[PDB]
Amino acid sequence: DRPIDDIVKNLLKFVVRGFYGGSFVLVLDAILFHSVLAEDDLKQLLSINKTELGPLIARLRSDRLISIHKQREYPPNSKSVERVYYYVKYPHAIDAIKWKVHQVVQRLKDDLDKNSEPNGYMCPICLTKYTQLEAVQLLNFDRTEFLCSLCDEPLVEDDSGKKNKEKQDKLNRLMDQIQPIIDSLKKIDDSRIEENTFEIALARLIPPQNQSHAAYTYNPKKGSTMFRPGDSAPATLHINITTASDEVAQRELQERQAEEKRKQNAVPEWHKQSTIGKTALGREERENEKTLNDYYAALAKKQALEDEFEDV
Amino acid sequence: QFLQWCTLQPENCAVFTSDNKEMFQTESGLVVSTYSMVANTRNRSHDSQKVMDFLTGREWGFIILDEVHVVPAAMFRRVVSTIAAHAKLGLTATLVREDDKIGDLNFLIGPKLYEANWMELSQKGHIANVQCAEVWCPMTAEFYQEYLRETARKRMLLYIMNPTKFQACQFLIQYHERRGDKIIVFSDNVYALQEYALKMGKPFIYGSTPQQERMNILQNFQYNDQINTIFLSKVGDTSIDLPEATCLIQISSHYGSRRQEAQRLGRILRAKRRNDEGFNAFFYSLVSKDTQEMYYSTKRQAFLVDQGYAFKVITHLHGMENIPNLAYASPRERRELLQEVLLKNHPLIRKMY
Amino acid sequence: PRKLQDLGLKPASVDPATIKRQKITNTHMTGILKDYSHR
Numbered sequence A: 001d002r003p004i005d006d007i008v009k010n011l012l013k014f015v016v017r018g019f020y021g022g023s024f025v026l027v028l029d030a031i032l033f034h035s036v037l038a039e040d041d042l043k044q045l046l047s048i049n050k051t052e053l054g055p056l057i058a059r060l061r062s063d064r065l066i067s068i069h070k071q072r073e074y075p076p077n078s079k080s081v082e083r084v085y086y087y088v089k090y091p092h093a094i095d096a097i098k099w100k101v102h103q104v105v106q107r108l109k110d111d112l113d114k115n116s117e118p119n120g121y122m123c124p125i126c127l128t129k130y131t132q133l134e135a136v137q138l139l140n141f142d143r144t145e146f147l148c149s150l151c152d153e154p155l156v157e158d159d160s161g162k163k164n165k166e167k168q169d170k171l172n173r174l175m176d177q178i179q180p181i182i183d184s185l186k187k188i189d190d191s192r193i194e195e196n197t198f199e200i201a202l203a204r205l206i207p208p209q210n211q212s213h214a215a216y217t218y219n220p221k222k223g224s225t226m227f228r229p230g231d232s233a234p235a236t237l238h239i240n241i242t243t244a245s246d247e248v249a250q251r252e253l254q255e256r257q258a259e260e261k262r263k264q265n266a267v268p269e270w271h272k273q274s275t276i277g278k279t280a281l282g283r284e285e286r287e288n289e290k291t292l293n294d295y296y297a298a299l300a301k302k303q304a305l306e307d308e309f310e311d312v
Numbered sequence B: 001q002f003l004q005w006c007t008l009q010p011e012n013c014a015v016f017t018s019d020n021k022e023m024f025q026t027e028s029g030l031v032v033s034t035y036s037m038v039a040n041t042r043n044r045s046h047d048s049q050k051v052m053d054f055l056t057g058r059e060w061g062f063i064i065l066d067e068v069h070v071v072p073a074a075m076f077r078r079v080v081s082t083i084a085a086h087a088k089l090g091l092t093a094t095l096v097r098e099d100d101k102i103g104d105l106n107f108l109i110g111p112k113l114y115e116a117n118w119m120e121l122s123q124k125g126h127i128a129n130v131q132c133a134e135v136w137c138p139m140t141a142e143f144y145q146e147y148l149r150e151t152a153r154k155r156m157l158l159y160i161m162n163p164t165k166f167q168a169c170q171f172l173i174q175y176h177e178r179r180g181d182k183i184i185v186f187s188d189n190v191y192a193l194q195e196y197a198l199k200m201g202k203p204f205i206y207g208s209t210p211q212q213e214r215m216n217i218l219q220n221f222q223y224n225d226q227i228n229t230i231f232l233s234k235v236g237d238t239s240i241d242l243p244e245a246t247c248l249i250q251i252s253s254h255y256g257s258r259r260q261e262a263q264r265l266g267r268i269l270r271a272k273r274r275n276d277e278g279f280n281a282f283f284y285s286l287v288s289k290d291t292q293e294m295y296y297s298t299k300r301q302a303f304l305v306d307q308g309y310a311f312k313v314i315t316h317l318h319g320m321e322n323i324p325n326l327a328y329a330s331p332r333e334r335r336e337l338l339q340e341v342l343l344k345n346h347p348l349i350r351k352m353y
Numbered sequence C: 001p002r003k004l005q006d007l008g009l010k011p012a013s014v015d016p017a018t019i020k021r022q023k024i025t026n027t028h029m030t031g032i033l034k035d036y037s038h039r
């Protein structure tokens, strides 16, 4: 696993744990621990109902923290069934997280800017908001009180005068709490991530169950030109050791090869000599060594399931 | 070779043959065609007619005539006068031809510029050395008795299909295959070529062979270890580059043609292993003794002898009897072959039909 | 991705719409000749 993969996994875990409930953490942690995970395998792993799993998967799919992949599987001894797999498309998830973080921060900043503006006015009866400029044109002839148009009743000053500090405190808190995501996004931007696909994710699969009914394989149909929205992404060494006998044999073989080479380039017998007079063509030392060894020893003592298969 | 040797861009190159007739759209280029595609005047395709109109309208600057010895023919000489060009170059290994029109080349294209010796290059290592040999195959009595009575036209096949030549060819093929030589067997006569090929289980190539099939034959004979000998014909006599070819044999020859003798010899002069020490290419000429084939054989080598090549007469090939099987070894088969070779010579009424 | 680029933030994705999808003469030798088409 690459360090960038670890970084993005940590970012996803933090986002899920901080901005989602507990069951969301369970589901996404399961799908992060494993590769593409079947619906039945996920249900068995987390021991949660289909109805409970529904909202979690739906919310994670809406936030694009989890991608879906439906394919038709044909068991050898059962009716085929369209199985649903869940995985994480890191580029899409990162983009969604970045956009949502930016939007939240921008919303709080805009709320602070709006609150810094004057209060306004409200009508207690019709519950209508009037800006300062809109209320300035509705005052009574006595120049004493602002009167509503529909109700002809005095207006009441709006709230939010004292929240000026509260919104700033909220922003200060949020930035500190959201600090980790920013650093993870910085590292992610420094690095480059490759988009994930069902087949690619299957390469890192850890089987959930011994006999999971889902077939975790990707067998695309042959010559299928159909395109669905958002379904595409951008020797042997041998060593030989020689001995003295092999050395003499090798020189002998080289001599034989040289003889064969000279024979190959040699002129034929008929061309070598003028063949005019020929008929026309048509239809013991061992005991000596032993006594030597004995004598030297005496001297020393004196001094001292059938289918296609390819071979590879 | 044009593209390989020079930096000619493919866009500026055009090939004018029977298959594709497109011409380069660049201002200047080269047009490579054939005498058949330039000298014809009666029948032309629509595309070929546009090509001819292009050639005539444009004023060419240089013409290169490969194998110019055919330009003085009855009408091929007409292309020199019709085609417009400021410079004419001819390239040919032999400046001789049977008729007296060879002298017409002086006023057709000009004089000869340069000539190169053969033995000088052979000893300097530029070309290979050849041990040219002439095999004397004695005709057997059974066929010779028919040779005496048969007319001029039949004796040609008779003395070309003698069994002794078959037996010698088989023995030489086995010996040279054991020596690991790449063998070419030339034969002008298509019937003799086919008979030899079917008898020896080896492929034959002649005019009827398609381009794809002959190219496949050449590629396999080159790079396949199983195959080492082929039976070519007059088609591959000249203007073919065979770096691998080393041994050349002639069983049937086109009469006394001295130019074709040299052109056929030219195939093996560019052997790949033509520089290894002690190498000597082989050129066999099988001829039947006591026949006009000897007359024609001695008439077709007067140019090689002039150049300096000397033919060695081989009366016998040693060790021929020890070969296990020989073609046409039995007198019964000889008699059967004798007899065989002698015998060689209203729309609604449309449904009705 | 276009909005993320407009806001100056590097987008780690691309629009899927931009993903470009992408008479033989002699026969006694039949079954003998391997096709040495290229070298």
Ligand code: BEF
Residues within 6 Å of the ligand: B093, B238, B239, B240, B241, B266
């Ligand atoms: F003279 Be070459 F073989 F074209």
Ligand SMILES: [Mg+2]
Residues within 6 Å of the ligand: B066, B239, B240
């Ligand atoms: Mg040439």
Ligand SMILES: [Zn+2]
Residues within 6 Å of the ligand: A123, A124, A125, A126, A127, A128, A148, A149, A150, A151, A152, A153
């Ligand atoms: Zn009101």
